[PDB]
Amino acid sequence: SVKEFLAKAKEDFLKKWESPAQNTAHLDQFERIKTLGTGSFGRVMLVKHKETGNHYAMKILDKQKVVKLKQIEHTLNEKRILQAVNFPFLVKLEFSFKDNSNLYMVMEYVPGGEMFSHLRRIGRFSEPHARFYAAQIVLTFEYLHSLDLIYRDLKPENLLIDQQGYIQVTDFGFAKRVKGRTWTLCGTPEYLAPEIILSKGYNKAVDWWALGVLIYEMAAGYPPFFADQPIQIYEKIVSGKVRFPSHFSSDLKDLLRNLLQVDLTKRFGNLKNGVNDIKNHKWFATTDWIAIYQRKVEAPFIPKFKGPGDTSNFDDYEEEEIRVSINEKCGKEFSEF
C-alpha cells in the first residue's frame, strides 16, 4: 500500500531526523579527482574513497561564504534532511564531516550527468520521455511531502541521470521541514510559484507548481516564463498567462493548466485528493506508478558509460586547491553539522 509504505518511511525518517549522523569520515580518506559542478558556496568533485575504491560526489561548502550569504540555517537543513531520507530517486548521502574551513557532504556519484545538459543539447524531450521523468518527480514529492518536507529547488540542473536512465534529485540546499506555512524567498526565478514572489506565505504546493514548470521545460525545450532578467520573469509568472507549443498534446496542456494554477484552491497536488489528482490525470494514463517505483520500466535514455570514474557526461570546470585554514572558522554556527 502507499499508506503502509509511507508510514514505514516516516518512522525511519524521524529516527534519523531526531538523531542525525555526524562526522562519519575525514577529508584524507578521499582522493579528489575532478569538479563536476559548482555553486555559490563551493563545488562538487568526483572523489575516490581510498580504502574501498568506491567513487562518490563530494560537495564542499566554504563556511565563510555560507555565512556571508546568510545561508547557515539552510545549510543545516540541507544536511539534516538529506542524511535522514531514503527514496530510490533521491541522491544518497554516504558521509558528512567538516574541518576548519569547509563543510563536506559525500554523496553517491550519479554518472549520467545533469538532465539540464541532455535537455539543452537534444532541444526538447518527447512526451513519453518527459513523462517518465515527471513520474519519478511525482513519487519523490509524494514521499518528501509525507515527511513535511518542501524541496523548493526543482530544475533540470538538479536532476542527475543514473546508469539505468532514472533520475536522482540533488541539492537539498532549500529543503525545509515545515508543518504549515513558510515565507523565505528562495528557489530559482523561472521555477518560483506566484505566492513566493508575492510574499504571501506558502506551502508544499509550490513544489507542484515547479513540477508544472519542469514538465513544460522538458516538453517544450524552454520554460513557460523566461526573460533576460529575473524581474521580468516574475512579472510573467504573476501574470500567470501561459502559452503552449502547438505540438503539446491536449492532455499535456490540461495537466499543465492545473499545475501552473495561480489559485491554490484549484492547483493540482493541493486538493482533497492530493497527489492522486496528478497520478490519475489522463496524460499519465499510460504510467505504471508501481513499476516506476520498482525501476522496472525501460528508460527512454541510457547514458554513455565508458568506465567507473568517467565524467564525460559532465561539463568541465576550473579547478582550485582545497585549502584548509589552520584556524577554525565559524565553529559555533555549524556546531550541529
Binding site: 555553486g39 555559490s40 550569504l69 546568510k70 545561508q71 539552510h74 539540464f116 539543452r120 532541444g123 529547488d153 530544475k155 540542473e157 540546499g173 532549500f174 523565505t184 524567498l185 528562495c186 528557489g187 530559482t188 526565478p189 523561472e190 518560483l192 517544450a220 525545450g221 524552454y222 520554460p223 523566461f226 526573460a227 533576460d228 529575473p230 502559452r243 507549443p245
Partner: peptide, 20 residues
C-alpha cells in the same frame, strides 16, 4: 519563434538560485 527567442536569450545556461 518562441524557441528562437529563448536560444537568443541570456538564460539558456545554468540558472543560479536566489537566496532571497
Amino acid at each position: 519563434t518562441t524557441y528562437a527567442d529563448f536560444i537568443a536569450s541570456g538564460r539558456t545556461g545554468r540558472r543560479n538560485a536566489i537566496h532571497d
